[PDB]
Design a protein around this nucleic acid. Structure first.
Ligand SMILES: [Zn+2]
Ligand SMILES: [Zn+2]
Lengths: 56, 49, 158, 119, 215, 147, 119, 56
DNA sequence: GCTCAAGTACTTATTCCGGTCATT
RNA sequence: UCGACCAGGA
DNA sequence: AAAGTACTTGAGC
């Protein structure tokens, strides 16, 4: 459905923003790493997550 | 070594685009690492743009 | 966790820090070697108060503990973040070093609250320098401060 | 026997801090009163040691360095002279002695590490 | 460092309990009252004036139970020794080795702190038919037989072994094996040739019994 | 083009990440042992430290990379003359032909023909290869300092 | 550290203690040279490094078309024309902090909202 | 890819495929999808010689 | 000269099912 | 009809 | 194709 397709497009769009926000937070040194993990390892996990939540 | 790399880079890039330097000749300028690498090497795989 | 203390969140954190291996290397920003000739005083004016509390009274005796030590200083600076994060006292760190070299190294330190965390080291009773760089390698690499060997990153789980 | 000589030197330090720390109490919100008050902690820290039957020397420094501090720890040092338990302050000695500025960072760290190793 | 004296005593009391648990499990007369001895009561008995644990006094004798005599009639008395020296000297070992001979003990368990002289351990197979066993203090702090994954190991009598081989038509080489040095075989004081009946729970039958021969 | 002189030069950073005395040695063709860079530089004619150091580390301010070079200066310290370096190169690995006067001559040969055959194989060039070996050590320490 | 060389033979200077006057000297081991030390510091480790972050900032930095642009105003010239990048320290641990280079005054500034620097 | 600016950690840059097989993949989406697909084709080829020997 | 880390040699695999070459 | 290489199939 | 066995070399002390 066209409406379903709008919902799907805005679902990906919102997850992109969620990522960008986590990107801006990590760029301003506000991000804190989840034990035995790099700050980069921590950011990646949460980015991969938001996008896989979105695909689902 | 070179003292004004930008001037030399524009010169060489214009020379190859004219045909004076063979079009297959690879010429890279890493500004961050302060290096000019030129390859006249046989065997390099290239693509047109 | 112990059958009783199964939901005891505080006992979990306690065992977590009791078993996780912690080396001096993990809590050090930089180590330096200074030529501070008279051991009773200090060239570095930053460290002036370190000698004024630890070195003054006591003494460890009056002075007796052989102050004719060595003119070469090993100055270690510790990261307040990683110190407090891994729950450590300057005294804890200091006593662990003083127990490794027994009576071959006169060790002193800045207190837990001071602006900079410093550990001042000097050898005890011809030819030196090269041996000091060997002592600092043994310090960072070997000396265990807290935890059991082979046990890295310990994590809590519900 | 040697113990008394080691205790003697320890008291000398407290009175030195009790003369050069007591000045801002009068500046916002003398050498004789500092001597008596120095002895009040030297025998109080001795209560904490050799129970029923080394640690002490280190407790002396943390009491000296923290109570010295200012202009953040002076607000805590003000309470010490003004009816704040001198008995509790002796067996206190840890992150509790620290500056309100340093205790803000210590609490900011501790509660942030907690969410990282809880997985 | 009052903390290090307090932690050392816990570990020693813990290991003492495990020796008591091991000797009770080996078929010797030890009460559950003896095993579950409190830390307070332990200190009260074996610590000196300064509160320092006197290991010399800990050493004890254990005699086989009435049922132990029925299955194993040749199972004699046992002596357990705890040494206050972290490094157990060759002079100290000779004093121990001779204690067993004169009192005609069957077995002797030496509980050492850090190490025993390579000189001193040459005297171990020197007094037959009696056997000497060595155990490190830290190795005994925790009783490994009390673990989830460690099933009930039972030492079979010579007659019981003879029956197992008859009923299953086996040569000794056809029985699953247990290493002489195996933590449990060490606990039971298993001697080469001895057989253990391992009774364990099964997600298949609820109860399954296997057997292992010492080597 | 020219029989393709396949001579792979290895410039190794001996000593692990945090281990005491981290020296840099290099394997040249037809020489058994690994020679500390300082001796090779001295064999090329570049004799004092800070001429050898100047060829490796370009910025005088970069103390971090220069402290990495102190143990190399100490390794090659034994050799102080170009001939003392050539004799040392000659002695180490084929070699065999015992008599001082000949090992020195065929050490020059290894550096001219086999050490960095690209650039040149001609006699006069020492200076050109000296800077290149320096460039290689610079690239090695740059990765070692995680830059 | 910032170490010196022997004038005359241009070689590495090694430490030497003047036990008489309790002062540090730097001797040449290729000749008879000796010079007084500038600083009491002889060796510096640094486990937690900061040099390598602002690496490769050449004046031609703006001419890299690969580099991304931003509309961030400069703390000095206030020009909304800059070419940014991430810490050039190639370690696993390293944060994703951005370093900006002004396409006017060529001043280096960060996105770092945890602390303030001068590099 | 050379179509992106340096230090780009956006979903598009590090290989997220926003589109569906119906809508069709962009050239970048296509190359990244091929990259991941190649990983599967390798895994299948190796874990046959490996898994095969385990069986024996 | 003895223990012991470490370097060395040298061993070992990987399901079933037409064309071309040179030589047997 | 001695067996090596190359190319494929599931 | 990386990881094991079974020696042997170096050298800590
Ligand atoms: Zn000189
Ligand atoms: Zn600007």
């Amino acid at each position: 459905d066209g409406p379903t397709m709008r919902e799907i497009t805005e679902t990906i769009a919102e997850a992109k923003k969620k990522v960008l926000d986590v990107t801006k937070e990590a760029q301003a040194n506000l991000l804190t790493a989840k034990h035995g993990m790099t700050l980069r390892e921590s950011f990646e996990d949460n980015v991969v997550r938001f996008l896989n939540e979105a695909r689902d | 070594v070179h003292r004004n790399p930008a001037r030399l880079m524009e010169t060489l890039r214009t020379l190859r685009r004219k045909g004076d330097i063979n079009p297959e000749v690879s010429m890279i300028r890493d500004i961050r690492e302060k290096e000019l690498k030129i390859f006249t090497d046989a065997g390099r795989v290239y693509r047109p743009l | 966790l112990e059958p009783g203390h199964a939901a005891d969140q505080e006992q979990a954190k306690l065992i977590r820090s009791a078993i996780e291996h912690t080396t001096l290397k993990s809590v050090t920003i930089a180590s330096e070697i200074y030529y501070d000739p008279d051991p009773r005083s200090t060239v570095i004016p930053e460290d002036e108060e370190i000698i004024q509390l630890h070195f003054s009274l006591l003494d460890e005796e009056a002075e007796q503990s052989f102050d004719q030590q060595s003119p070469w200083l090993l100055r270690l600076e510790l990261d307040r973040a990683a110190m407090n994060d891994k729950d450590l006292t300057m005294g804890q760190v200091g006593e662990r070093i003083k127990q490794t070299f027994k009576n071959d190294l006169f060790v002193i330190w800045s207190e837990d609250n001071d602006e900079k965390l410093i550990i001042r080291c000097r050898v005890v009773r011809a030819e030196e320098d090269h041996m000091l760089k060997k002592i600092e390698n043994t310090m960072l690499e070997n000396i265990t401060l807290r935890g059991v060997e082979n046990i890295e990153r310990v994590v809590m789980m519900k | 026997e040697k113990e008394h000589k080691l205790r003697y030197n320890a008291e000398k330090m407290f009175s030195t801090l009790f003369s050069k720390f007591i000045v801002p109490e009068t500046i916002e919100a003398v050498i004789s009163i500092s001597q008596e008050f120095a002895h009040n902690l030297e025998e109080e820290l001795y209560k904490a040691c050799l129970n029923v039957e080394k640690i002490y020397t280190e407790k002396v420094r943390s009491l000296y360095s923290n109570l010295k501090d200012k202009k953040n720890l002076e607000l805590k040092a003000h309470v010490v002279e003004g009816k704040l338990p001198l008995n509790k302050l002796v067996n206190m000695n840890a992150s509790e002695l620290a500056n309100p500025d340093l205790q803000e960072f210590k609490e900011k760290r501790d509660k942030i590490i907690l969410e990282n190793f809880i997985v | 460092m009052d903390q290090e004296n307090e932690r050392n005593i816990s570990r020693l009391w813990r290991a003492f309990r495990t020796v008591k648990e091991m000797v009770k499990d080996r078929g010797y007369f030890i009460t559950q009252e003896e095993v579950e001895l409190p830390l307070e009561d332990f200190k009260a008995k074996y610590c000196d004036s300064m509160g320092r644990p006197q290991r010399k006094m800990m050493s004890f004798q254990a005699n086989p139970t009435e049922e132990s005599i029925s299955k194993f009639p040749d199972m004699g008395s046992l002596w357990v020794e705890f040494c206050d020296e972290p490094s157990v000297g060759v002079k100290t070992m000779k004093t121990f080795v001779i204690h067993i001979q004169e009192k005609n003990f069957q077995t002797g368990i030496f509980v050492y702190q850090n190490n025993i002289t390579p000189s001193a351990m040459k005297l171990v197979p020197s007094i037959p038919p009696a056997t000497i066993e060595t155990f490190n203090e830290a190795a005994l702090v925790v009783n490994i037989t009390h673990h989830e994954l460690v099933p009930k190991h039972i030492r079979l009598s010579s007659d019981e072994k003879r029956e197992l081989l008859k009923r299953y038509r086996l040569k000794e080489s056809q029985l699953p094996r247990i290493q002489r040095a195996d933590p449990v075989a060490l606990y039971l004081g298993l001697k080469r040739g001895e057989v253990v009946k391992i009774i364990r729970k099964s997600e298949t039958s609820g109860r399954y019994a296997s057997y292992r021969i010492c080597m | 083009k020219g029989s393709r002189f396949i001579s792979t030069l290895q410039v190794k950073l001996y000593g692990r990440e945090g281990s005491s005395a981290r020296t840099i040695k290099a394997t040249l063709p037809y020489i058994k042992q690994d020679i500390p860079i300082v001796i090779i530089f001295r064999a090329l004619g570049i004799i004092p430290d800070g001429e050898i150091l100047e060829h490796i580390c370009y910025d005088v301010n970069d103390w971090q990379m220069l402290e990495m070079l102190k143990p190399c200066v100490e390794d090659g310290f034994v050799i102080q003359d170009r001939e003392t370096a050539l004799d040392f190169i000659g002695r180490r690995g084929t070699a065999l032909g015992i008599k001082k006067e000949k090992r020195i001559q065929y050490a020059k040969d290894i550096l001219q023909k086999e050490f960095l055959p690209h650039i040149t194989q001609l006699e006069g060039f020492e200076s050109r290869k000296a800077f290149f070996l320096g460039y290689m050590i610079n690239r090695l320490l740059l990765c070692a300092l995680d830059r | 550290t910032t170490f010196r060389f022997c004038r005359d033979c241009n070689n590495m200077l090694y430490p030497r203690e003047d036990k008489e006057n309790n002062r540090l000297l730097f001797e040449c081991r290729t000749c008879s040279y000796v010079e007084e030390a500038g600083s009491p510091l002889v060796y510096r480790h640094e486990l937690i490094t900061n040099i390598g972050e602002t690496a490769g900032v050449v004046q031609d930095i703006g001419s890299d078309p690969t580099l991304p642009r931003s509309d961030r105003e400069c703390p000095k010239c206030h020009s909304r024309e800059n070419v940014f990048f991430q810490s050039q320290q190639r370690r696993k641990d390293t944060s994703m902090v951005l370093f900006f280079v002004c396409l006017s005054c060529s001043h280096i500034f960060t996105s770092d909202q945890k602390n303030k620097r001068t590099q | 890819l050379p179509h992106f600016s340096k230090d780009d950690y956006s979903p598009e840059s590090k290989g997220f495929v926003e589109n569906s097989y119906l809508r069709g993949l962009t050239p970048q989406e296509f190359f990244f999808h091929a990259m991941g697909g190649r990983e599967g084709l390798i895994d299948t080829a190796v874990k046959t010689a490996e898994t095969g020997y385990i069986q024996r």
